[PDB]
Amino acid sequence: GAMGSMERASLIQKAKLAEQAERYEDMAAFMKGAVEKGEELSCEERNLLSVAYKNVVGGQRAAWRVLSSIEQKSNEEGSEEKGPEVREYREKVETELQGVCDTVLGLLDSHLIKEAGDAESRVFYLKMKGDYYRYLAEVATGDDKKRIIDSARSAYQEAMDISKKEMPPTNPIRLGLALNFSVFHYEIANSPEEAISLAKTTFDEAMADLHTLSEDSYKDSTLIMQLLRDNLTLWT
């Protein structure tokens, strides 16, 4: 690994600098290096890992969607043949995205998840596993579309069962997991009714727990609850 000669603390410090510089590919490489040191990650370090790869894959997903739309229009009735270039370039971006997803999933499997014993770390990483199988599923079309979808569902479900048992309904990671599982249902699994039911039940149970929170935690939880609300407004 190119980061093997750098101190763990230095990699974390540089990941924070790269975030300030909006250098997210660098940020992801630094946090990959930090994970490969083999020690568990703190709450803040898990968040840095997530921000880095979310931004990297975010740019790739946004590009793939632009290109996939051009490719779809190219295959409409009346569209002039332009040769293989659109498909080629869509495939290049798709392959790069898949490689980033594979890299994240490999970090979770070697060996973040297996060493995650606390509910907050285990749920965070299982959510992440669902998320990156979900991004794979957004672009999947062949023999393994169904297995990729089931891998996402399985990871999210294990994370939900732990979160329900071990975390309060307003816990931000529990809320973000439920949010993202509902997006999985709506956008990936062709189950909009499941998506809506999950989002509503999540929102209502969090609402009833807000009275237990400080002003700062209240703000953190309500911010995420607003995303559940926005989705429900779009979905119904």
Binding site: L179, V183, I224, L227, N231, L234
Partner: peptide
């Protein structure tokens, strides 16, 4: 257009 965890 669905929103996921930020």
């Amino acid at each position: 257009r669905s929103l996921s965890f930020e």
